[PDB]
Amino acid sequence: ALPQTVRIGTDTTYAPFSSKDAKGEFIGFDIDLGNEMCKRMQVKCTWVASDFDALIPSLKAKKIDAIISSLSITDKAQQEIAFSDKLYAADSRLIAAKGSPIQPTLESLKGKHVGVLQGSTQEAYANDNWRTKGVDVVAYANQDLIYSDLTAGRLDAALQDEVAASEGFLKQPAGKEYAFAGPSVKDKKYFGDGTGVGLRKDDTELKAAFDKALTELRQDGTYDKMAKKYFDFNVYGD
């Protein structure tokens, strides 16, 4: 059976997907999608704030029933839990100076200095696929020094999460003269084939209901109107 109330864990530190406004209400595209889906499933849903590292543990322990927290559908993720159909893409993308010919390819990146934040999935991606093929991958302890170095010319480009750099630098005045160089980088093992509602593998009726609500609010234009409230591009992706 479907739960009486679906408890949804989210990490409220990740606008524009999941954050808390100044009055403390949950806000973002993850919330709107969750709320819309739950409305279509006709079930009560309750948002449970949780540190991101504790989301999958809370789910396996049944302290929560779903995860909606830009949780990438990576290969390792799927060994432990199940996912709904994709909610939106969370790929990475290179940033360089406006007019840069740089592409996210080996023949383009050979011998170039690409910055990445240490500990990120972008650093893992760039170290396992780019550093070992003659790309100079530079790890940074501090995200704002990446941007500063890039503006200074000590990097040819930076590998960032696409939405985060969209919101955090490119829309800011400091990034006016910078832009994405080439298309978003896709890698199922590092970035998932999107994000999805994270669910326990036993919870097939819950998965079915989220997927049906998801296809439906897409097919009738609700997804696009809702995304337009936050995004200028195709957040859903491929």
Short mmCIF file of C-alpha atoms in Angstrom, two decimals:
data_model
loop_
_atom_site.label_atom_id
_atom_site.label_comp_id
_atom_site.label_asym_id
_atom_site.label_seq_id
_atom_site.Cartn_x
_atom_site.Cartn_y
_atom_site.Cartn_z
CA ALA A 1 0.00 0.00 0.00
CA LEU A 2 0.89 3.63 -0.41
CA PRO A 3 1.82 5.49 2.77
CA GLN A 4 -0.71 7.65 4.56
CA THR A 5 1.88 10.47 4.59
CA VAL A 6 4.96 10.40 2.42
CA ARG A 7 7.93 11.76 4.41
CA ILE A 8 10.40 13.41 2.01
CA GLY A 9 13.94 14.15 3.14
CA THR A 10 15.76 17.04 1.47
CA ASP A 11 18.95 19.04 2.11
CA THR A 12 17.77 22.64 2.31
CA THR A 13 21.10 24.18 1.32
CA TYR A 14 20.82 24.02 -2.47
CA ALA A 15 18.85 26.80 -4.16
CA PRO A 16 17.16 26.96 -6.55
CA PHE A 17 16.23 23.34 -5.92
CA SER A 18 15.95 23.07 -2.14
CA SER A 19 16.43 25.83 0.41
CA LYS A 20 14.56 27.59 3.19
CA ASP A 21 13.20 31.10 2.71
CA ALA A 22 13.64 33.65 5.51
CA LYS A 23 10.36 32.58 7.17
CA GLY A 24 11.60 28.99 7.15
CA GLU A 25 9.35 27.51 4.46
CA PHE A 26 10.82 24.91 2.11
CA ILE A 27 11.39 26.50 -1.32
CA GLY A 28 12.73 25.47 -4.73
CA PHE A 29 12.08 23.44 -7.88
CA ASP A 30 12.56 20.17 -5.94
CA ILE A 31 9.77 21.28 -3.57
CA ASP A 32 7.41 22.40 -6.38
CA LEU A 33 7.98 19.07 -8.19
CA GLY A 34 7.50 17.08 -5.01
CA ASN A 35 4.42 19.04 -4.02
CA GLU A 36 2.89 18.84 -7.51
CA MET A 37 3.54 15.08 -7.73
CA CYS A 38 2.14 14.39 -4.25
CA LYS A 39 -0.90 16.47 -5.24
CA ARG A 40 -1.41 14.24 -8.28
CA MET A 41 -0.78 11.03 -6.36
CA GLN A 42 -3.33 12.40 -3.84
CA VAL A 43 -1.19 11.76 -0.76
CA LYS A 44 -0.07 14.06 2.04
CA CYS A 45 3.63 14.84 1.92
CA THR A 46 5.87 16.19 4.68
CA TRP A 47 9.28 17.77 4.04
CA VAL A 48 11.95 16.65 6.52
CA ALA A 49 15.13 18.74 6.58
CA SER A 50 18.20 16.55 6.61
CA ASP A 51 21.91 16.85 5.98
CA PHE A 52 22.62 15.41 2.52
CA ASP A 53 24.92 12.66 3.81
CA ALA A 54 22.14 11.38 6.08
CA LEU A 55 19.48 11.14 3.35
CA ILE A 56 20.17 7.65 2.04
CA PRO A 57 20.76 6.30 5.58
CA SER A 58 17.44 7.82 6.75
CA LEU A 59 15.74 6.23 3.78
CA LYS A 60 17.07 2.71 4.36
CA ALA A 61 16.19 3.03 8.08
CA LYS A 62 12.69 4.15 7.09
CA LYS A 63 12.87 7.46 8.96
CA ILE A 64 11.82 8.92 5.58
CA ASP A 65 9.98 7.54 2.55
CA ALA A 66 11.58 9.44 -0.35
CA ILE A 67 14.53 11.66 -1.25
CA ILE A 68 14.07 14.77 -3.42
CA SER A 69 17.34 16.63 -3.03
CA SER A 70 18.98 16.81 -6.49
CA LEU A 71 19.93 13.21 -5.84
CA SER A 72 21.81 12.07 -8.96
CA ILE A 73 20.89 8.64 -10.33
CA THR A 74 24.47 7.41 -10.40
CA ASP A 75 25.45 3.79 -10.93
CA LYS A 76 26.66 3.43 -7.33
CA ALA A 77 23.47 5.07 -6.06
CA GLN A 78 21.38 2.43 -7.77
CA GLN A 79 23.18 -0.43 -6.01
CA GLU A 80 21.48 0.68 -2.77
CA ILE A 81 18.24 2.41 -3.71
CA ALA A 82 15.71 2.82 -6.48
CA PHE A 83 14.80 6.00 -8.35
CA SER A 84 11.86 7.51 -10.15
CA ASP A 85 12.13 8.65 -13.75
CA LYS A 86 14.47 11.62 -14.11
CA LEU A 87 13.33 14.89 -12.51
CA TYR A 88 15.95 17.08 -14.31
CA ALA A 89 19.56 16.90 -15.39
CA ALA A 90 22.44 17.66 -13.02
CA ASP A 91 25.33 17.52 -15.41
CA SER A 92 28.51 19.57 -15.26
CA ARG A 93 29.78 22.05 -17.80
CA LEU A 94 32.91 24.04 -18.56
CA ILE A 95 33.11 27.79 -17.91
CA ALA A 96 35.56 29.98 -19.82
CA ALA A 97 35.82 33.53 -21.14
CA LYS A 98 33.10 34.64 -23.51
CA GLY A 99 34.20 33.58 -26.97
CA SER A 100 36.43 30.76 -25.80
CA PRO A 101 36.74 27.96 -28.40
CA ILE A 102 37.19 25.38 -25.63
CA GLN A 103 35.14 22.22 -25.85
CA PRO A 104 34.71 19.51 -23.22
CA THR A 105 36.81 17.09 -25.33
CA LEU A 106 40.29 15.61 -25.00
CA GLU A 107 41.56 17.10 -28.25
CA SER A 108 40.24 20.46 -27.05
CA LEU A 109 41.43 20.12 -23.41
CA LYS A 110 44.90 18.65 -24.07
CA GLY A 111 47.45 20.77 -22.25
CA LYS A 112 44.86 23.15 -20.80
CA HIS A 113 44.42 24.18 -17.17
CA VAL A 114 40.94 23.18 -15.97
CA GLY A 115 40.03 24.14 -12.39
CA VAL A 116 37.84 21.98 -10.15
CA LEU A 117 36.81 22.15 -6.49
CA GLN A 118 38.47 19.48 -4.40
CA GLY A 119 36.09 16.87 -3.03
CA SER A 120 33.54 17.57 -5.76
CA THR A 121 32.14 15.05 -8.19
CA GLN A 122 33.55 17.36 -10.85
CA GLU A 123 37.01 16.69 -9.47
CA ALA A 124 36.40 12.92 -9.49
CA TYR A 125 35.13 13.10 -13.06
CA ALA A 126 38.03 15.23 -14.26
CA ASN A 127 40.64 13.11 -12.47
CA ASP A 128 39.35 9.78 -13.79
CA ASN A 129 38.69 10.86 -17.43
CA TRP A 130 40.78 13.98 -18.16
CA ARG A 131 43.93 14.17 -16.01
CA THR A 132 45.08 10.78 -17.25
CA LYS A 133 44.89 11.97 -20.87
CA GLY A 134 47.09 15.06 -20.68
CA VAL A 135 44.64 17.62 -19.27
CA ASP A 136 46.14 19.70 -16.47
CA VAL A 137 43.43 19.35 -13.81
CA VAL A 138 43.92 21.86 -10.96
CA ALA A 139 42.08 21.16 -7.69
CA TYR A 140 41.04 24.11 -5.52
CA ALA A 141 40.15 24.18 -1.85
CA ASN A 142 38.00 27.28 -2.32
CA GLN A 143 35.31 27.68 -4.98
CA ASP A 144 35.63 31.46 -5.17
CA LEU A 145 39.32 31.22 -5.97
CA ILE A 146 38.40 29.08 -8.99
CA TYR A 147 36.26 31.91 -10.32
CA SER A 148 38.94 34.45 -9.33
CA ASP A 149 41.72 32.49 -11.03
CA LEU A 150 39.58 32.00 -14.14
CA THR A 151 38.98 35.74 -14.33
CA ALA A 152 42.69 36.22 -13.73
CA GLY A 153 43.75 33.94 -16.59
CA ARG A 154 45.47 31.28 -14.51
CA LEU A 155 42.84 28.80 -15.72
CA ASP A 156 41.64 28.16 -19.26
CA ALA A 157 38.34 26.85 -17.88
CA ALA A 158 36.55 25.49 -14.84
CA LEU A 159 34.41 22.34 -14.54
CA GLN A 160 31.33 23.17 -12.47
CA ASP A 161 27.87 21.82 -11.88
CA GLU A 162 25.92 23.44 -14.69
CA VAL A 163 23.07 24.97 -12.68
CA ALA A 164 25.31 26.09 -9.79
CA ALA A 165 27.60 28.08 -12.09
CA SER A 166 24.52 29.41 -13.92
CA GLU A 167 23.11 30.72 -10.66
CA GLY A 168 26.31 31.55 -8.84
CA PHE A 169 28.76 33.30 -11.18
CA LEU A 170 27.35 33.71 -14.68
CA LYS A 171 24.27 35.59 -13.41
CA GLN A 172 26.44 37.57 -11.09
CA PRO A 173 28.16 40.72 -12.34
CA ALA A 174 31.62 39.15 -11.96
CA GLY A 175 30.76 36.51 -14.53
CA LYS A 176 29.28 38.84 -17.17
CA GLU A 177 32.26 38.27 -19.46
CA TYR A 178 32.17 34.46 -18.98
CA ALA A 179 29.92 31.76 -20.42
CA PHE A 180 29.59 28.05 -20.83
CA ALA A 181 32.13 26.63 -23.26
CA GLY A 182 30.55 23.80 -25.17
CA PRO A 183 27.75 21.52 -24.04
CA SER A 184 27.08 20.00 -20.67
CA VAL A 185 29.23 17.01 -19.71
CA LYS A 186 27.25 13.79 -19.26
CA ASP A 187 28.51 10.81 -17.28
CA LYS A 188 26.04 8.36 -15.71
CA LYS A 189 28.63 7.10 -13.22
CA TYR A 190 29.46 10.59 -11.90
CA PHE A 191 26.38 12.75 -12.61
CA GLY A 192 23.57 10.23 -13.01
CA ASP A 193 21.26 10.32 -15.97
CA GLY A 194 19.59 13.20 -14.12
CA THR A 195 18.26 13.49 -10.60
CA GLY A 196 15.39 11.40 -9.32
CA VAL A 197 13.16 10.76 -6.35
CA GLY A 198 15.20 8.39 -4.18
CA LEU A 199 13.15 5.43 -2.93
CA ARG A 200 13.57 2.09 -1.17
CA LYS A 201 13.87 -0.74 -3.67
CA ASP A 202 10.91 -2.53 -2.07
CA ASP A 203 8.66 0.51 -2.58
CA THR A 204 7.43 -0.25 -6.10
CA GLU A 205 3.94 1.19 -5.60
CA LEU A 206 5.53 4.40 -4.40
CA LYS A 207 7.84 4.46 -7.42
CA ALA A 208 4.96 3.81 -9.81
CA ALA A 209 2.90 6.67 -8.40
CA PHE A 210 5.73 9.22 -8.57
CA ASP A 211 6.50 8.21 -12.19
CA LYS A 212 2.88 8.52 -13.28
CA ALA A 213 2.50 11.95 -11.68
CA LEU A 214 5.82 12.92 -13.21
CA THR A 215 4.96 11.93 -16.79
CA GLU A 216 1.57 13.60 -16.38
CA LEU A 217 2.61 16.98 -15.09
CA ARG A 218 5.21 16.98 -17.88
CA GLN A 219 2.72 16.05 -20.62
CA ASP A 220 0.31 18.87 -19.73
CA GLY A 221 2.81 21.77 -19.48
CA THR A 222 3.05 22.01 -15.64
CA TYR A 223 6.75 21.10 -15.60
CA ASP A 224 7.66 23.89 -18.05
CA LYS A 225 5.65 26.62 -16.32
CA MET A 226 7.25 25.57 -13.02
CA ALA A 227 10.77 25.41 -14.42
CA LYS A 228 10.35 28.84 -16.06
CA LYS A 229 9.99 30.26 -12.57
CA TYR A 230 13.70 29.45 -12.07
CA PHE A 231 15.47 28.61 -15.34
CA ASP A 232 16.18 30.26 -18.73
CA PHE A 233 17.32 26.99 -20.36
CA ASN A 234 16.26 23.33 -20.63
CA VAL A 235 16.80 22.18 -17.05
CA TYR A 236 15.34 18.76 -17.89
CA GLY A 237 18.14 18.18 -20.38
CA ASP A 238 18.36 15.08 -22.59
#
